[model samples]
Target: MDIDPYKEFGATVELLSFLPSDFFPSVRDLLDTASALYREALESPEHCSPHHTALRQAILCWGELMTLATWVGVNLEDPASRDLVVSYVNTNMGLKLRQLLWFHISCLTFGRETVIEYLVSFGVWIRTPPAYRPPNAPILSTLP
Candidate 1:
């Protein structure tokens, strides 16, 4: 089946209204429902600001972790126990998971690196130019 896509993420944002973080993975309902819906929302969204783009990326990252957390039946928040989080992956989890696992292998070069590090990271996906790609040109200029 096909979806509007915009309506997809639009609903995710709306669901967040009462999808309290503390209640996820255990306490209440709508957890997986929201997660699945949230992931679907990103499949191909309509016109969105970088802010919304960034937000969905973050949500998916954490939401995946949340999904894994549910599978492993543990809280990923506990980094000391994060080795446990890998159960969600074996062969693949994408660049998002790679940067995360790679760093744990004797990583963290210095102070500011934290800002650049990934526990999970965000990526920009524009229907047009994203990630400051001057090569592609900005929307206002790329159009005729």
Candidate 2:
């Protein structure tokens, strides 16, 4: 039995299976919002140039999708959570297939390092607790 075939097929299936049953509505809404933002951003050159606007829109959409995936993963305690997150990263984003594959591979290969860096970043650390912390814990630190 060749392991390569299994790995390839699994990866393809994994990438296609990001949308959770309950999250599809939110995902659809986010996509619509992103599309509108892209269209509006492209319609006029006053706010930003076409190229910059497109990039900004894409980045915002990608970030929103990732945020949703993370919410499902951490809050739902779903084992498929990580797979779903990776799938979203691969699919909805404007990344090429090879680029997405490399990103997924890199994420898996250096998971701990990536997580550590994420934890060290103020933005990520601050956002995570309130979003993913247990219900018993305080929502966020009050000490400024």
Candidate 3:
């Protein structure tokens, strides 16, 4: 379902207090530009162009980010809400291809350490293998 950008914007702004400090100006610009585009798209007669669809998806991503941020903001304080937040994060971030957006939103609302901790608890973190070096690799040999 398409989200209401106006409501998402206002709600997200209100939840900004929950964050440790000011967020990125680019995010604000993104939301503002998205809202404007949404309005323009709504009034335009041609709605099936690639530009229109691209803008539509952009706005949707922004809306989803704000909504997730707002959710974490409102639910951050209570212990009982931890599982709910984790579930939502998994559902929105883990199960989908929108990991970058979800990570940004989570870090924005819950702090990087907190988000990483939660993901770690859920066994959702990345593990880098030890650097691989083939024995007697040609790159290791002295150049003539």
Most TM-score-accurate candidate: 3
Model 3 scores a TM of 0.30
Give residue 58's error in model 2 in angstroms: 0.9
Clashes of 3: 0
Tens digits of lDDT, candidate 2, 21-133: 32223334434544554456545566553333434444566678668767777777666667767676655553332223332332333442452343244334334656674
lDDT against true structure, model 1: 0.35
Q: Which ten residues in a row have the lowest lDDT in candidate 1?
A: 103-112
Kindly give the number of clashing pairs for every candidate.
Answer: 0, 0, 0
Candidate 1: pairs in clash? none
TM-score for predicted model 1 compared with the true structure? 0.23
Q: How do the candidates rank by TM-score, highest first?
A: 3, 2, 1
Best by lDDT: 3
Q: In angstroms, give how far residue 46 of model 1 lies from its true place.
A: 2.3
How far does residue 53 in candidate 3 sit from its true spot (Å)?
0.8
Candidates in order, TM-scores: namely 0.23, 0.30, 0.30
